[PDB]
Design a protein around this motif. Structure first.
Motif, PDB file in Angstrom:
ATOM      1  N   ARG A  55       0.829  -1.173   0.000  1.00  0.00           N
ATOM      2  CA  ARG A  55       0.000   0.000   0.000  1.00  0.00           C
ATOM      3  C   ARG A  55       0.876   1.241   0.000  1.00  0.00           C
ATOM      4  O   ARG A  55       1.961   1.238   0.652  1.00  0.00           O
ATOM      5  CB  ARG A  55      -0.813   0.022   1.286  1.00  0.00           C
ATOM      6  CG  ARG A  55      -1.777  -1.132   1.311  1.00  0.00           C
ATOM      7  CD  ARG A  55      -2.776  -1.033   2.463  1.00  0.00           C
ATOM      8  NE  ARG A  55      -2.167  -1.243   3.780  1.00  0.00           N
ATOM      9  CZ  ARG A  55      -2.857  -1.436   4.907  1.00  0.00           C
ATOM     10  NH1 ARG A  55      -4.189  -1.439   4.901  1.00  0.00           N
ATOM     11  NH2 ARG A  55      -2.214  -1.630   6.052  1.00  0.00           N
ATOM     12  N   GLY A  56       0.375   2.327  -0.611  1.00  0.00           N
ATOM     13  CA  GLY A  56       1.061   3.596  -0.555  1.00  0.00           C
ATOM     14  C   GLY A  56       1.576   3.967   0.819  1.00  0.00           C
ATOM     15  O   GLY A  56       2.718   4.354   0.952  1.00  0.00           O
ATOM     16  N   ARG A  57       0.771   3.757   1.848  1.00  0.00           N
ATOM     17  CA  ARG A  57       1.129   4.156   3.206  1.00  0.00           C
ATOM     18  C   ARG A  57       2.071   3.226   3.908  1.00  0.00           C
ATOM     19  O   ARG A  57       2.429   3.468   5.071  1.00  0.00           O
ATOM     20  CB  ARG A  57      -0.118   4.232   4.063  1.00  0.00           C
ATOM     21  CG  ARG A  57      -0.578   2.848   4.475  1.00  0.00           C
ATOM     22  CD  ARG A  57      -2.086   2.787   4.425  1.00  0.00           C
ATOM     23  NE  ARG A  57      -2.565   3.307   5.687  1.00  0.00           N
ATOM     24  CZ  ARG A  57      -2.742   2.555   6.771  1.00  0.00           C
ATOM     25  NH1 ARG A  57      -2.500   1.246   6.712  1.00  0.00           N
ATOM     26  NH2 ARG A  57      -3.195   3.107   7.898  1.00  0.00           N
ATOM     27  N   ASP A  58       2.456   2.146   3.263  1.00  0.00           N
ATOM     28  CA  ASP A  58       3.624   1.361   3.767  1.00  0.00           C
ATOM     29  C   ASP A  58       4.879   2.209   3.849  1.00  0.00           C
ATOM     30  O   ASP A  58       5.767   1.952   4.653  1.00  0.00           O
ATOM     31  CB  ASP A  58       3.906   0.179   2.867  1.00  0.00           C
ATOM     32  CG  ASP A  58       2.944  -0.977   3.098  1.00  0.00           C
ATOM     33  OD1 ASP A  58       2.423  -1.062   4.201  1.00  0.00           O
ATOM     34  OD2 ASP A  58       2.786  -1.824   2.201  1.00  0.00           O
ATOM     35  N   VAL A  59       4.957   3.209   2.997  1.00  0.00           N
ATOM     36  CA  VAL A  59       6.029   4.194   3.100  1.00  0.00           C
ATOM     37  C   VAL A  59       5.606   5.068   4.228  1.00  0.00           C
ATOM     38  O   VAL A  59       4.744   5.902   4.116  1.00  0.00           O
ATOM     39  CB  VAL A  59       6.261   4.962   1.825  1.00  0.00           C
ATOM     40  CG1 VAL A  59       7.370   6.003   2.018  1.00  0.00           C
ATOM     41  CG2 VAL A  59       6.639   3.958   0.732  1.00  0.00           C
ATOM     42  N   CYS A  63      -1.637   7.693  -4.300  1.00  0.00           N
ATOM     43  CA  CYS A  63      -0.268   7.665  -4.771  1.00  0.00           C
ATOM     44  C   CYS A  63      -0.243   7.042  -6.144  1.00  0.00           C
ATOM     45  O   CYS A  63      -1.066   6.160  -6.468  1.00  0.00           O
ATOM     46  CB  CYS A  63       0.565   6.798  -3.886  1.00  0.00           C
ATOM     47  SG  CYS A  63       0.862   7.443  -2.239  1.00  0.00           S
ATOM     48  N   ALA A  64       0.666   7.548  -6.944  1.00  0.00           N
ATOM     49  CA  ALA A  64       1.107   6.901  -8.141  1.00  0.00           C
ATOM     50  C   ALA A  64       2.265   5.960  -7.737  1.00  0.00           C
ATOM     51  O   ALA A  64       3.241   6.409  -7.068  1.00  0.00           O
ATOM     52  CB  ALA A  64       1.527   7.916  -9.132  1.00  0.00           C
ATOM     53  N   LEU A  82       3.104   1.707 -14.379  1.00  0.00           N
ATOM     54  CA  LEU A  82       2.436   2.711 -13.499  1.00  0.00           C
ATOM     55  C   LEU A  82       0.955   2.387 -13.167  1.00  0.00           C
ATOM     56  O   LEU A  82       0.142   2.311 -14.052  1.00  0.00           O
ATOM     57  CB  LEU A  82       2.518   4.061 -14.160  1.00  0.00           C
ATOM     58  CG  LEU A  82       1.964   5.236 -13.345  1.00  0.00           C
ATOM     59  CD1 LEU A  82       2.885   5.546 -12.148  1.00  0.00           C
ATOM     60  CD2 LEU A  82       1.904   6.405 -14.298  1.00  0.00           C
ATOM     61  N   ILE A  83       0.664   2.321 -11.870  1.00  0.00           N
ATOM     62  CA  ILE A  83      -0.607   2.049 -11.273  1.00  0.00           C
ATOM     63  C   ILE A  83      -0.968   3.223 -10.345  1.00  0.00           C
ATOM     64  O   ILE A  83      -0.152   3.635  -9.465  1.00  0.00           O
ATOM     65  CB  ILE A  83      -0.522   0.758 -10.405  1.00  0.00           C
ATOM     66  CG1 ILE A  83      -0.041  -0.427 -11.280  1.00  0.00           C
ATOM     67  CG2 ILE A  83      -1.867   0.407  -9.788  1.00  0.00           C
ATOM     68  CD1 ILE A  83       0.363  -1.697 -10.533  1.00  0.00           C
ATOM     69  N   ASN A 113      -5.064   3.472   1.152  1.00  0.00           N
ATOM     70  CA  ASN A 113      -5.364   2.112   1.620  1.00  0.00           C
ATOM     71  C   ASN A 113      -5.675   0.871   0.669  1.00  0.00           C
ATOM     72  O   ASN A 113      -5.639  -0.238   1.163  1.00  0.00           O
ATOM     73  CB  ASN A 113      -6.433   2.203   2.711  1.00  0.00           C
ATOM     74  CG  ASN A 113      -5.826   2.022   4.062  1.00  0.00           C
ATOM     75  OD1 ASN A 113      -5.562   0.890   4.501  1.00  0.00           O
ATOM     76  ND2 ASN A 113      -5.485   3.130   4.687  1.00  0.00           N
ATOM     77  N   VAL A 114      -5.993   1.046  -0.616  1.00  0.00           N
ATOM     78  CA  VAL A 114      -6.031  -0.064  -1.572  1.00  0.00           C
ATOM     79  C   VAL A 114      -4.672  -0.834  -1.558  1.00  0.00           C
ATOM     80  O   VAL A 114      -3.629  -0.203  -1.662  1.00  0.00           O
ATOM     81  CB  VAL A 114      -6.287   0.507  -2.995  1.00  0.00           C
ATOM     82  CG1 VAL A 114      -6.196  -0.535  -4.081  1.00  0.00           C
ATOM     83  CG2 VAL A 114      -7.667   1.165  -3.070  1.00  0.00           C
ATOM     84  N   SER A 115      -4.678  -2.157  -1.423  1.00  0.00           N
ATOM     85  CA  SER A 115      -3.475  -3.012  -1.600  1.00  0.00           C
ATOM     86  C   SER A 115      -3.288  -3.453  -3.044  1.00  0.00           C
ATOM     87  O   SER A 115      -4.265  -3.538  -3.792  1.00  0.00           O
ATOM     88  CB  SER A 115      -3.610  -4.265  -0.745  1.00  0.00           C
ATOM     89  OG  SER A 115      -3.703  -3.921   0.633  1.00  0.00           O
TER      90      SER A 115
END
Length: 716
Positions: free
Chosen positions: A563-567, A584-585, A594-595, A600-602
């Protein structure tokens, strides 16, 4: 009060973490501050001793992560949920309550150093040691610090800072001056020649790397240039180079010869050399000049429990000529003065943890360590004033809690090109040890080989490490396709800003041992995050065999997700964090895909053992409804987003203005096709994939003249 002992329990925000705390264990919240969020912990004993051990309490049913010394010199990771799984020589312990995180930092106090160890009864014992029979204490008040909070990384940092304010004897990583080598590609002679290195070999390696278009701007002349002799251990016989480093006419000319060749002829900015904290592996040959006397390593129980071979190591049995503390400054200064006057910019200082075993009747492990580092730092500041010091083999709290100046630390055991067990383990070790070591200094994830089956595995890790990047290739054995993903044509790298670390997700799940999880490592650039995902199952250090081995795995492939927020700090890359919705891109550097990933989407990620994938993660900015953008960076480089120096959105003009370093293919996410892409005032061609939003154009050349970065304007 947050963290307290009452009854005989340790309670942290109303969760019992330990039960059965002894009556003689005492806590306080005073210091300079003095009132302090967590608690200092100590103990009172009946007698003077040079060693104590005491239970702090009993631990069950709470997930932990610890960094422990599996050898004198080096840490690795161990997870668990019972006090009995806590290793000997635990230097850092993080506990989870199921939301709340507690850190336990065993400290140096006066002449004693402490660590933690588990026992059969699930107790956590604090072990206090002076390393000197003549240095004895019976009570202690600040031998351990415990602090809790809801952000595990912030918790750690706040604790370190609290401890710093108490001891004043170290600085935090972010307060220290990084040497200039961190921004350039380097090369180290160690795996290329080992101790048989010569000045001709140095020059050959520099020339081969540069000829392929990835020029190193620093070199580390590793072990093998010094004047050493047997008395089968070698000891330092003089401070100048050996015959392999003497100009072949004029043998009066010395190491200055190779330094001048490196810099004037091959364009290097820095030259560093290796030396032991004791001179060489066997110290310095006994003598008046530096007061060197034969000394034999004292064994401590925790070290020898985890590393039994230490009892019969050559250093243990044949001893070291230890320079006198009265003359240590003079030794370092004369060595470093010679080096600096020859054009040398720094030292890689190894064998550092030996001092803890030689404090004999010299005040013990803490005082001896402090003395030698005090002298070394003075000499480094005088003679290598770019702060030219890499700490190596130095993972003891005695040195960490006196780390007042040096700013780079080797984060793990050596890269081993010929040892297949080592690769997975290396990535786990550097990532988990960086959680703690990176609070003191910038982690160095060590040299590697560009031509090796694990090359991309290691390479990608270094690219997200936050640390110096350098190979140890033999001359001619280079993969330049791989090196161009790390190094620009001027020798500059895209260094990330923090120590690379496991995601919150990965802190309590051992990805070398659990058979079930992928390791995910995050870092930050200024306008993007980066995330690397690794399968490192299948090998680790053995509690039974007491060395690194392979072990059974349930399957080859594992599936996890990102997920973006893993960063963890991805927010800080957003140009408008208070309005950012968290989208996030996400650019897969390996697949080239590129996705867009909403908050929160995994996304699922599947990897076999020793495979990896790297993702650049950029916050999307919503300029107006239907017009949204995020820069990616140099998409053919592992740490693509490291190229973005400046970024500004002008929604009133539907424009994006960027400052970009480097050259190559540049990428960004845009919801709409651009009208124009402009680079230094000229319009340029670009490609746009309507389906993913990927915009790409080529940055042809490095920035020239007064530019220093490319100025890019994207009109939407």
């Amino acid at each position: 009060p947050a963290v307290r002992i009452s009854d005989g329990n340790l309670i942290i925000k109303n969760r019992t973490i330990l039960t059965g705390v002894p009556d003689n264990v005492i806590t306080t919240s005073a210091s300079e501050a003095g009132p302090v969020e967590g608690v200092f912990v100590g103990a009172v004993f009946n007698k003077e001793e040079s060693k104590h051990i005491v239970p702090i309490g009993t631990l069950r049913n709470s997930r932990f992560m610890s960094c422990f010394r599996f050898k004198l010199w080096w840490m690795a990771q161990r997870m668990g949920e019972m006090g009995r799984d806590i290793p000997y020589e635990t230097q850092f312990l993080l506990v989870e309550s199921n939301k709340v995180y507690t850190v336990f930092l065993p400290l140096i106090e006066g002449s004693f150093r402490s660590c933690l160890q588990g026992n059969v009864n699930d107790e956590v014992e604090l072990c206090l040691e002076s390393g000197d029979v003549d240095t004895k204490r019976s009570s202690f008040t600040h031998s351990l610090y415990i602090h809790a909070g809801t952000d595990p990384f912030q918790t750690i940092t706040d604790a370190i800072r609290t401890v710093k304010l108490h001891l004043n004897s170290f600085r935090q990583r972010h307060e220290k001056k990084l040497p200039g080598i961190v921004d350039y590609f380097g090369w180290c002679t160690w795996d290329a020649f080992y101790q048989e290195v010569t000045q001709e070999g140095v020059e050959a390696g520099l020339k081969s790397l540069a000829a392929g278009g990835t020029p190193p701007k620093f070199v580390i002349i590793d072990d093998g240039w010094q004047s050493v002799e047997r008395d089968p251990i070698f000891r330092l016989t003089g401070i100048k180079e050996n015959e392999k480093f003497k100009k072949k006419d004029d043998p009066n000319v010395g190491i200055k010869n190779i330094v001048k060749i490196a810099k004037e002829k091959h364009g290097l900015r820095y030259v560093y050399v290796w030396h032991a904290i004791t001179g060489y592996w066997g110290g310095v040959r006994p003598g008046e000049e530096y007061g060197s006397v034969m000394k034999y390593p004292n064994m401590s129980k925790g070290v020898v429990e985890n590393d039994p071979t230490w009892k019969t190591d050559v250093m243990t049995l044949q001893g070291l000529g230890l320079v006198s503390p009265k003359k240590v400054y003079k030794f370092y200064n004369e060595l470093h003065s010679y080096l600096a006057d020859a054009g040398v910019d720094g030292v890689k200082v190894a064998v550092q943890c030996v001092l803890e075993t030689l404090g004999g009747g010299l005040g013990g492990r803490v005082e001896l360590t402090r003395q030698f580092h005090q002298a070394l730092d003075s000499s480094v500041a005088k003679n290598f004033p770019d702060n030219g010091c890499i700490a190596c083999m130095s993972h003891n709290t005695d040195a960490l809690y006196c780390s007042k100046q040096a700013a780079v630390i080797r984060a793990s055991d050596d890269f081993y090109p010929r040892d297949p067990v080592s690769h997975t383990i290396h990535i786990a070790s550097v990532a988990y040890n960086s959680v703690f070591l990176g609070e003191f200094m910038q982690p160095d994830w060590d040299m590697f080989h560009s031509v090796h089956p694990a090359a991309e595995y290691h390479a990608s890790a270094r690219a997200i490490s936050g640390g110096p990047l350098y190979v140890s290739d033999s001359p001619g054995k280079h993969n330049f396709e791989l090196l161009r993903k790390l190094v620009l044509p001027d020798g500059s790298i895209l260094r990330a800003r923090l120590p690379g670390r496991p995601t919150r997700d990965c802190l309590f799940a051992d990805p070398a041992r659990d058979g079930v999880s992928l390791l995910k490592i995050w870092n930050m650039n200024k306008y993007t995050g980066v995330l690397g995902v690794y399968n490192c199952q299948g090998a680790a250090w053995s509690s039974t065999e007491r060395k690194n081995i392979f072990h059974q795995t349930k399957t080859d492939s594992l599936t996890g997700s990102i997920r973006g927020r893993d960063v963890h700090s991805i927010s800080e890359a957003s140009t408008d964090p208070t309005t950012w919705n968290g989208d996030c891109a996400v650019y897969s550097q390996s697949r080239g895909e590129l996705i867009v990933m909403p908050y929160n989407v995994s996304l699922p990620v599947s990897l076999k053992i020793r495979e990896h994938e790297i993702f650049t993660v950029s916050p999307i900015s919503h300029l107006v409804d239907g017009v949204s953008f995020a820069p990616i960076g140099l998409v053919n480089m592992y740490n693509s987003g490291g190229a973005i120096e400046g970024l500004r959105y002008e929604a009133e003009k539907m424009k994006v203005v960027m400052e970009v370093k480097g050259c190559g293919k540049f990428g960004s996410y845009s919801s709409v096709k651009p009208k124009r892409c402009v680079v230094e005032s000229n319009e340029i061609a670009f490609e746009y994939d309507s389906s993913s939003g990927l915009v790409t154009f080529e940055l042809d050349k490095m920035p020239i003249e007064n530019k220093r970065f490319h100025l890019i304007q994207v009109e939407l």
